[PDB]
Amino acid sequence: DLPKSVDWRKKGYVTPVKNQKQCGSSWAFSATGALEGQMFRKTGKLVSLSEQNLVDCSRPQGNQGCNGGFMARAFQYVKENGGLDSEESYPYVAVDEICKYRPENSVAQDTGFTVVAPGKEKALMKAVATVGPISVAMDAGHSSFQFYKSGIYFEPDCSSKNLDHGVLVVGYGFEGANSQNSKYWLVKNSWGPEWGSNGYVKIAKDKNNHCGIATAASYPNV
């Protein structure tokens, strides 16, 4: 069976928290976060990947740069493009810019992606436990989320269907002694280390797909 808790940050799969700043690019940070963990599982090397490469170059796949996008369209771009540049070689500037993808600087590849069954939190738990960090979308449009600081996030006004923010599930756990009580998903955001809990948020788990965390989850195939 699956572990009572998982935290891929403790195993070297997760880069330090990044900051998308004033650009609608959380989808790009969610996608690079999932590819960073899959490339680490494959090679043992953790290398920060370029969100800007995704913002500037994946319009053909249907993304809109700083005006929004989807993680699956990003994994589709990496596959069609044959690669993705490192954060070091293609730095983030938080504005739409000319595509400058360089194949010689590519440090990652994927053959497409796997989708988690929509709305199934236990399928998501199995993906997190057996694959690594998973890209997910959520409803983050609330002041309670903007000002989140600690504890299990639970917002009554949250939607499980109309999502507006891409994030990365890096694990799951529970508070207390009963592994089934006060469960939560461990989620990496892209609003900087300063937001929330060192840039992370615990979102309530197995509470009817709260905030839609299991509605549109996926991970790249490397």
């Binding site: 004033q22 650009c23 983050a140 609003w191």
Partner: peptide
């Protein structure tokens, strides 16, 4: 979503 952007942080405010």
């Amino acid at each position: 979503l952007l942080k405010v």
